[PDB]
Design an enzyme around this catalytic site. Structure first.
Site, PDB file in Angstrom:
ATOM      1  N   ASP B  16      34.025  88.033  38.995  1.00 54.25           N
ATOM      2  CA  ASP B  16      33.917  86.631  37.870  1.00 54.25           C
ATOM      3  C   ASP B  16      32.345  86.655  37.143  1.00 54.25           C
ATOM      4  O   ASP B  16      31.597  87.294  37.716  1.00 54.25           O
ATOM      5  CB  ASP B  16      33.976  85.452  38.840  1.00 54.25           C
ATOM      6  CG  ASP B  16      34.770  84.425  37.912  1.00 54.25           C
ATOM      7  OD1 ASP B  16      35.121  84.551  36.729  1.00 54.25           O
ATOM      8  OD2 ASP B  16      34.761  83.084  38.388  1.00 54.25           O
ATOM      9  N   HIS B  33      34.280  92.038  29.167  1.00 61.33           N
ATOM     10  CA  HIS B  33      35.281  92.651  29.692  1.00 61.33           C
ATOM     11  C   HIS B  33      35.154  94.172  29.712  1.00 61.33           C
ATOM     12  O   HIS B  33      35.455  94.855  30.599  1.00 61.33           O
ATOM     13  CB  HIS B  33      36.609  92.372  28.938  1.00 61.33           C
ATOM     14  CG  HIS B  33      37.124  90.930  29.098  1.00 61.33           C
ATOM     15  ND1 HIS B  33      36.959  90.010  30.187  1.00 61.33           N
ATOM     16  CD2 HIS B  33      37.760  90.105  28.233  1.00 61.33           C
ATOM     17  CE1 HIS B  33      37.479  89.092  30.298  1.00 61.33           C
ATOM     18  NE2 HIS B  33      37.995  88.834  28.903  1.00 61.33           N
ATOM     19  N   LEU B 123      36.543 107.384  49.089  1.00 64.54           N
ATOM     20  CA  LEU B 123      36.875 106.049  48.526  1.00 64.54           C
ATOM     21  C   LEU B 123      38.439 105.853  48.286  1.00 64.54           C
ATOM     22  O   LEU B 123      38.783 106.745  47.279  1.00 64.54           O
ATOM     23  CB  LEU B 123      35.717 105.451  48.124  1.00 64.54           C
ATOM     24  CG  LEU B 123      35.720 103.896  47.797  1.00 64.54           C
ATOM     25  CD1 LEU B 123      34.748 103.301  48.167  1.00 64.54           C
ATOM     26  CD2 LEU B 123      36.183 103.599  46.370  1.00 64.54           C
TER      27      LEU B 123
END
Lengths: 222, 228
Positions: B16, B33, B123
């Site tokens: 956020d 974004h 990962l």
């Protein structure tokens, strides 16, 4: 901007140990503390309080502690018979001692017409348990021809859960831990989280007003 | 400095603050974004070095469809660029969420990146795209109902283990959730999977969240483990 408050009442053991008392001395305060918090919350206009009294994981404690808690819960339901708030219980009741099962049933029936604040006690409850029992219920209805898989949506599912809408606006956890520990998982999706190091036996009117003030400031911010 | 033995193996990330960051910087809304691609490459590299094994990142909620069609169309093109960029990046990539509602080119880009990276060894980056906690629980419930109705399941077998096999976000569940931008809620991210997760909230905006902020979060997780 007044909040349904969900309450995780942690810190009773630490509170008693710091004071030189036995472990059960802090547990024992659940009764006067919830009476105190019900009185304050009614004055502020709250509406619903859901309090995490006994998790499905709490059975792993010593048999002596679990037996004390189960007797304490019986005393709790007896004390709230004439207290004047509406009382409900969520959780698996069939695993509880029979005397406690019948005390729960009596207090639920006796208080069901009490007006105003609704106190929900989560006893032998967990978020996994609630979601799974709702799933089993939905499967049973589909297998009996009472519902279509396409009707399974948020509205239908929330009707099968034990903790009902309106979902908590604010969760308060005392004792300093910043987790929800398998409490109201589905119902906490948009809830504001408020964590305080204050131990539950010390949590009073000024602490609750601070949590509400923080809730109001966060609402204006976001 | 961190203790090697108390590193969270799975971190969930709510990303956020992109819009507020761009506004504060004098840029257009889309500028924040766009940084998802370099930001997640940066956090993947930092996390790999610290020994984190899984990151689940909340890229697009089921409620994000309520934004303007122009914004949603921009995001959908951005996600396609993201999966093309991660084809050769070297981490294992998976996607959770309702894919059938996405543009078909994006559905096939997702599928290709999942297949191409499925054997990558370090990962595991899970992107939650058109995902929500309600959605995950409901699709698991519908799957179980369908199996029961098709005669494939004894109802006495419905338990936590079965339910976890049907959910999209899999065990091991997040040890730590990090949400940037200051809000102290989970906003319908990984509901079932957060039952025992540590919650860490920071006012730092996501485009500003870097190696030092991530180490601070991990350091805080370790201290909570010592305390409790």
């Amino acid at each position: 901007l007044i909040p349904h408050i969900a309450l995780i009442m942690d810190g009773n053991r630490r509170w008693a140990k710091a004071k030189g008392l036995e472990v059960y001395e802090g547990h024992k305060l659940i009764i006067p503390k919830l009476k105190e918090i019900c009185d304050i919350s009614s004055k502020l206009g709250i509406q619903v309080i859901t309090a995490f009294a006994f998790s499905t994981e709490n059975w792993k404690r010593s048999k002596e502690e679990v037996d004390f808690l189960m007797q304490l819960f019986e005393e709790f339901f007896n004390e709230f018979l004439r207290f004047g708030v509406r009382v409900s219980v969520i959780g698996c009741k069939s695993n509880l001692p029979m005397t406690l099962q019948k005390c729960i049933a009596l207090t639920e029936e006796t208080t069901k017409g009490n007006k105003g604040l609704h106190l929900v006690i989560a006893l032998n409850y967990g978020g996994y348990y609630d979601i799974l029992q709702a799933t089993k219920s939905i499967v049973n209805k589909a297998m009996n021809g009472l519902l279509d898989v396409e009707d399974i949506n948020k509205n239908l599912f929330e009707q099968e859960l034990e903790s009902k809408c309106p979902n908590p606006d604010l969760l308060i956890r005392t004792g300093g831990e910043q987790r929800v520990s398998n409490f109201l998982l589905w119902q906490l999706a948009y809830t504001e989280f408020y964590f305080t190091n204050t131990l539950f036996p010390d949590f009073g009117e000024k602490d609750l007003k601070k949590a509400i003030l923080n809730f109001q400031q966060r609402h204006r911010r976001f």
